[PDB]
Amino acid sequence: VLPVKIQPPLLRPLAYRVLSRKYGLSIKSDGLSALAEFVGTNIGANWRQGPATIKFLEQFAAVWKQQERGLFIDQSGVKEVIQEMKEREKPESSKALDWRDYFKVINASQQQRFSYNPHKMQFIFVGGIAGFLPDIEDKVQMFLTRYYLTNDRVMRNENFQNSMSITPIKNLLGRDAQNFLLLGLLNKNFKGNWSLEDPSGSVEIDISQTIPTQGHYYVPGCMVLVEGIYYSVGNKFHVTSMTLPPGERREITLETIGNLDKDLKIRLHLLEKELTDHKFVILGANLFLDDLKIMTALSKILQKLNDDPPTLLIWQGSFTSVPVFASMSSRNISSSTQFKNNFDALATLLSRFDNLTENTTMIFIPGPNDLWGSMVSLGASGTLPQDPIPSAFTKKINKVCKNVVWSSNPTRIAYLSQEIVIFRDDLSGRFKRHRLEFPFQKVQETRKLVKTILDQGHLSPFLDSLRPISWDLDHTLTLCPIPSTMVLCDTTSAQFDLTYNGCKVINPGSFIHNRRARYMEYVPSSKKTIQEEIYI
Amino acid sequence: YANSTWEVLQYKDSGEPGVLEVFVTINGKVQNITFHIPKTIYMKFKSQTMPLQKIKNCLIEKSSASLPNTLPESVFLEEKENCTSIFNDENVLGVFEGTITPHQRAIMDLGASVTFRSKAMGALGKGIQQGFEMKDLSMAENERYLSGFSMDIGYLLHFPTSIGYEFFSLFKSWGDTITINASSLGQIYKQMFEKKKGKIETYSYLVDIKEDINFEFVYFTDISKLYRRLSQETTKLKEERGLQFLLLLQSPFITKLLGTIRLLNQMPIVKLSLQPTLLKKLVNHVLSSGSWISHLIKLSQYSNIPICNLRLDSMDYIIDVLYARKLKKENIVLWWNEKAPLPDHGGIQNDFDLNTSWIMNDSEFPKINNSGVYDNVVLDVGVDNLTVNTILTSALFVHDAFSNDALNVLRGMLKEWWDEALKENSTADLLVNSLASWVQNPNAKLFDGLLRYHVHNLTKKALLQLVNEFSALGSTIVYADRNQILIKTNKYSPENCYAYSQYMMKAVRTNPMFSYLDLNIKRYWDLLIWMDKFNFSGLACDYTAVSQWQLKKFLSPIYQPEFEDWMMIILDSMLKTKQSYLKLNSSVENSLNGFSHLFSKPLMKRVKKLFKNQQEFILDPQYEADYVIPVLPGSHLNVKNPLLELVKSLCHVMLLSKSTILEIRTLRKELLKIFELREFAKVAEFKDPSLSLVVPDFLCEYCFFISDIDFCKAAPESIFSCVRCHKAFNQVLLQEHLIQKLRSDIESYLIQDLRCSRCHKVKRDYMSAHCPCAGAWEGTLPRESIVQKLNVFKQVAKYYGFDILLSCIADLT
Ligand SMILES: [Zn+2]
């Protein structure tokens, strides 16, 4: 533990002798200097560092897998990894593992681009002021990628469970009366009649005399599994039974993707048991800060949480009563600055609690009436991958706390080996409005909604003419791994908590249902939820 | 309550949908009354008879017409159940399509402000205990004299500021105790306040002010005097005149009221919502408070509205209330949607629709602009009342069109207000101008995107018809932008202009379509070199001359005076040539055919001298302060030879004329020979140095002027202030509108329709590698266009110092 400074020239012989000869690692001058600094700091007289170098190189070859170790990033990374493995074994550090280094929240703009090579591959894709503008090919392939994902899901589930094959729509032309099973995107033709769209083509469908699976919502833009007899007399597909694709368990998708290292899995599993007492509190929807009654109720809720602050306090969308837009007036209407005043008022009612706002990440989720998204939509369901609340309106709130995250509407949480997805949207209303009728209670409707969302595998299985989506930011809506926990926030659906296909779906509902400021509590360790209604 | 108007209809809900305060001005004095109002819903039973009959009988089909995109279901407490009777069985709560109008609103819409309880004394006493339900009470009554005669006031104006001076001032009709060296300035304003009160005592005849105005200089250090002292003073005044005073409240933010003051003054309340130098503001406001009381009385007399109407663009609320009344007289469902700017189209208004989105974010007004030199006399005709005249004369399958019946209702109402204002009618004209301005106001309580789009198309087509009419009259158009139109009269002689112009205006007014369209000629141009609105010069009335060339701002500071001087030289040469042609006599070929010969040789020699001077001093320091290209919001061009840019601009403004193209091309070739540049070289071609960034249909909050503000081209003084007036514009409003346009551009790029790159057939399917004609898909809005627009926005924000716009740009990436 004796500190010492050792110059790179004397350490150079032994360093190379092991890094280069034993394993084949090239060490640069700057990297050699950094390694000499590390060895001098964490050991004296620089004699018994052979095991340290061996551990460094073996970790580097096991994880990083490249050359030129002296990049100031590879060396630091391997030293840190050595630190955590020594910590979990319980030197430079001998403390306990902290979940903060394994807890992260992923925005819609910072995920990994995963485009599926149509045959069999899930590839990885990963520049100026207008560097966020999607390209045209992104719009072209937006639905193709979704179809390929659904087709892979069907090829894994249906054939191994039910064994009719899937015939591409282009294969129905010459056939006169044979039976086919089509997987296509239900949509309305420009001529005004329903049809299914496939990468190979499209075909009109005669929806009369169809028996649909009643446990699903059927809407244009959702991908269905129709079955019927093609007719070449009028080029129509007389569908008999149409149902949504079967869902998949998350664990099944993980071995196909094959994404985790063993040490990271062990550490995450260990802190899963160690961190038993962590509480996630999910507030209600439509926190209308403009309303004085809701403002007073929020004070009582924050006071109650101040006694025992939770791990995360998630705030739902539509923070203001009226949609924000450019207002022509000489008063303090000023829909921009009035938002700033509302957040400043929130800061007053939030900085008053010293016990709260400390050791509590505060994630904020935007809604239909938030800045930069309500400017054009005027409070309607506009572009789905909503950008976070602008930082220009969060000066006081961010100054008051120390860990506050402003995230996208379809945000992702990486608290542990499990993934949590938060989504604020009135899915039930749109589903009911755009559900198509077949010419041929509340808990049942909630189950229908959850089943439709999970079977579709997409957060919004809707057409581009009903819910515009940023073309490149579409993977942020795809439920390819089917995350374990999903906060399907809503304002037109009754509060519920359901589990399906290994996924826990929780809907806190509106903040004020009749007279109570409802909010939800989530315990990741026990996977148990409970609502906390508080009277006004 | 007998023929008594409620002064304020404040929402005394107490959780009851229908219970609210009614301060009806009874014959003796105002008294607090409670009402009861069922929540009417316009859910017409479309092809489905539902016999459920939960609480109230439901009318079948409502005998009305819905909104393409007399009280059915008259419940009383929807709180009973939010889920209500959701069935989705052929329009039985399948689509709401009802009314969101809460209490305090349906009362004004249906019941007149003045009302009389058409019941006996026993029924009156029975209704005293619980309230006066509108179902069996409160018939609408005539409003010949709706207001009162002598009403006490409780003036409590307050103008806070962050500098550190508190304006928690209160005024009394007789107490005169204004509690805040002010006596001298107060008397100074009193010196003409004798005349002001004489006007009040001859036109208002409502209240009088005591002459002993005592000013109490008290410093409201903290809340103890900021709020508690004000509350105790106002409760002392309240117990002084018991429910016998009208609160004239002025406060930028109303939360001070609703804290404790509002329920301290439940009596009739009005929300005006409007260091030594700032002292005069208080005395001016207190001594002018006696002027608009008569205006409010007149407004409430004409418009059937109580005194609870807010003064923030009160014309918008008046128009909403009157339009709702005229629409309720007809069997048309309303689209109120008080909570949100979007129309109350049931529930279909909350989801994205491509057509609705397009009609919303499309306000670009076509401009007809012809560039050239016009030796003929051209008139700067300025149109006015285009929207009003358009809706009035619009009388003279389509899913994108507004309802024809609602438009007819609007036309009839506008005709009524118009004829009224024509005869002496103050409020009538106020409301016509206000309607012109509201149609496009999302804050309106009846705003409809379809209606605004319909009005926009009607205005576009009316302007096109006006242009065609002027062309037929024998005058070509060189500019038309919905606020002004420039016509090229064929009369060469400037003397023969007045009679021709008057004949033209009369002939335009003869057409029924433009009868209400008022036109006035602003300026006469004997000569005009027109490139754009912001790049023009010429002789104006024949003796004044103007040189407004935005191209000059993009030249190096040394050459800006050279361009300015040579513009005057060119204009004078053109004038001399025109005079010579007119003297000799008294487009293929006009009066100008050799105007370049006057200054060709001096210009060439000056350019040679300037080129030698530049070659001497281009690289040497201490001169780079002159040979520097200015940075402007529209700057997008890299300049290597600033003198070449100067000669390019001069040659372009000379090439504007169509007749003298050849003699100016020869001059340009000779000029370019100096730089050893070819005549048709790419670098020698003139490209506009400035881009454009227009905020369409920007509205001036004072004079109601609808103009397209351009930020990359207009001078800074012409964007922060209006045109017809000279009042300033809010920085926050400009930044908000710029952000709105930026988000509209982003959304329009994201929701664009792809089309084939070879046959241009629009893409119809969702999964398709390419067009069936073997052509790759391409967008109708290229990505490069949006990138350029974003760069323009960033340049404007960085130059003008728009902080919120910079925050938006940063938040994009
Ligand atoms: Zn103005």
Ligand SMILES: [Zn+2]
């Ligand atoms: Zn094509």
